[PDB]
Symmetry: D4
Amino acid sequence: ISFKPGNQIDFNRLFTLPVTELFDPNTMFVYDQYVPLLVNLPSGFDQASIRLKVISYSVENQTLGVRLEFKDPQTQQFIPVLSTGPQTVFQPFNQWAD
Amino acid sequence: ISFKPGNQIDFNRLFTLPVTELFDPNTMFVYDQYVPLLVNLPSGFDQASIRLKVISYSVENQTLGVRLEFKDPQTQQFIPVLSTGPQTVFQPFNQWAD
Amino acid sequence: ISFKPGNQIDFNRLFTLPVTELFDPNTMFVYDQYVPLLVNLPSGFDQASIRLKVISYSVENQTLGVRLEFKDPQTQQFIPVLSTGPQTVFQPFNQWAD
Amino acid sequence: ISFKPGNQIDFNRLFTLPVTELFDPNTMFVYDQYVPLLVNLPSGFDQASIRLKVISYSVENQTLGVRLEFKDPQTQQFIPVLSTGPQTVFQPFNQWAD
Amino acid sequence: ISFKPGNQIDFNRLFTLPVTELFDPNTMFVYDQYVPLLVNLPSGFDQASIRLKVISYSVENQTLGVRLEFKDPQTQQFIPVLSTGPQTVFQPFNQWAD
Amino acid sequence: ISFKPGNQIDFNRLFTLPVTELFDPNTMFVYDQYVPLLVNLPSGFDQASIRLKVISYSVENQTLGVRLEFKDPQTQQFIPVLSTGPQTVFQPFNQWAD
Amino acid sequence: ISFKPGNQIDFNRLFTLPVTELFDPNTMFVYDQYVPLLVNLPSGFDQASIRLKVISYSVENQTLGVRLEFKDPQTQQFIPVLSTGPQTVFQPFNQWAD
Amino acid sequence: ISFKPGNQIDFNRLFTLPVTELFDPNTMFVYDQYVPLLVNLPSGFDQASIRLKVISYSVENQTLGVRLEFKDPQTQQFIPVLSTGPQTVFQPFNQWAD
Ligand SMILES: [Cl-]
Ligand SMILES: [Cl-]
Ligand SMILES: [Cl-]
Ligand SMILES: [Cl-]
Ligand SMILES: [Cl-]
Ligand SMILES: [Cl-]
Ligand SMILES: [Cl-]
Ligand SMILES: [Cl-]
Ligand code: NA
Ligand code: NA
């Protein structure tokens, strides 16, 4: 009779986290499980080949400052891209605040 | 001579399921294979780090009420996000009905 | 309490047309109102600058063979792109058939 | 120094409306300004060539049941697509409810 | 011989503006030409039916706090959606800063 | 000085195959490696939970007629969705022909 | 019986142009009709508020070097964004060449 | 109080590489980890079934010329698609240059 469309829920409607929970507090690398959540990865990309170093984070602003490192295919050492600070400072999740 | 475009079929043209088939009826967790179908996951996201608890379901309306749980990277325990009811109530698949 | 997502309906769930209704049967140009439906136009594109000539059409297969013409910005004459037949032969709408 | 991405706000974060405000209560046609909000129109589509008849609406469920009509290019009369009820029954906007 | 793909340039690679240039400084409404740049509008949406009131703006942070108003189809008066502050506070454009 | 955008190549610019190469000619199931190419799968979907039965194929038209089967999470048996023929008949790849 | 998907043709399958045809050779501004083709404009953006100056073009490489100018909402004068050369150098259309 | 949208960072804002680092200099195949970065793969595609041969590369222009090879499902031999040169010549990453 009538078409009643369904829905697939956006992940950001179900999941949020304080920025301090995103990274290992002693190594300062984002936990592997959250790298695809912070970075829009190309389809099929092998996440074992990258890591995100947390250079800064703000509890007040719920922001992270990160630097990407990637695995050199020859040596298998993680190397930085291309200085001293973060490549990007961003607010990972939607907030409802002042 | 002439360009004749091809097509890639949308999964929702081939697959549908009654909502009672989406979850384990004794544990009340959505089966692992259907979590990406219900939730739009970011590219490369590790589904082993989440699970969906079915809080409610309606056979009449073909809806599910779910709560997301995620694996704490330190303890490896599944923890709820941020109460008592579902985070979302939705109709997973297109329906043709009253 | 619970998030209940809404929906915006895809135009193709509401609209379909026999291919003979898509074009002026005497001029053999697709009606202006259907050009954006047949061709995925870039956002903001001025449709007055193009037209689609129907070179072939199939009632049995519900296909159209078209050639695009565009308005030369200097002369304001419609000119073909870059032979004798259609640039593309395609089935504009979803069908449920043999 | 650091890249700080900006954002473009999704319209659905700013706009919502009770379903009774979506249509003319005497003619039962969705107001012209809301047709692109309810239907995902192809880029550049001429909205003057369509209208949405409200066949049903639910205040309790915040749903609308609509039928699309389109302008015949020859006669300029609005004609239905392809019965007696709505083509689709849907919830236009996100809701937070029971 | 070889396929050499072309490109369409993203608008954000060519255009940026200080936030004070986005709105009329005496009326505090975003200029009409920038409303589609700040808000992701559905395809074909009639922008004459909305306006964005600037409730706050930050020169230091390059952010705007806005409230959406829409035209009531009956009275043709602009009315707010659904309090006293902005509905959203966001950074419209990418920044490279501290 | 000047921004020179790069490009990521669409898979369909590099890959095409005759339809007879898409499936095992004795079992009549599409080869596992091509299931994501024929069906637009949701991000993260476990392809081990589905298979595509080739019900028909046309060398002349370069089309396939398929039926989807999915793994029942309890029994681990592949079961059809919801008759006797294909669920869909489509042309997987772009063609340049008569 | 079987679902047979339709198609909407991508504009780039039908339209291509030598780069010298994209702009007025005496004013060196891209013709208005091609601005949305070269730049990915946000939905609903008023193209009367921008123009593209051609700073360089290459017949051999089929590239254009452009600078965007926008209309100041107060004075109604076209002003450049934020030097002496192009903001971007790109190849507008797909090519098959050496 | 106010909605403050978050962001997910595009991979191309964090990662770039000289084209000589994209492939094994002795075998002339793109490293496995970069195949999804160069080619837009369908969701869920098994990258073990393809490889990219570098036929040409330009240090001056930061371009690569590649040919795709895929694994024949029967023999498990890598075979070329459908001559002697690259299928595509492209610039993988955004550049800021002359
Ligand atoms: Cl925190
Ligand atoms: Cl059920
Ligand atoms: Cl017909
Ligand atoms: Cl209401
Ligand atoms: Cl400012
Ligand atoms: Cl074949
Ligand atoms: Cl030229
Ligand atoms: Cl290099
Ligand atoms: Na994926
Ligand atoms: Na549009």
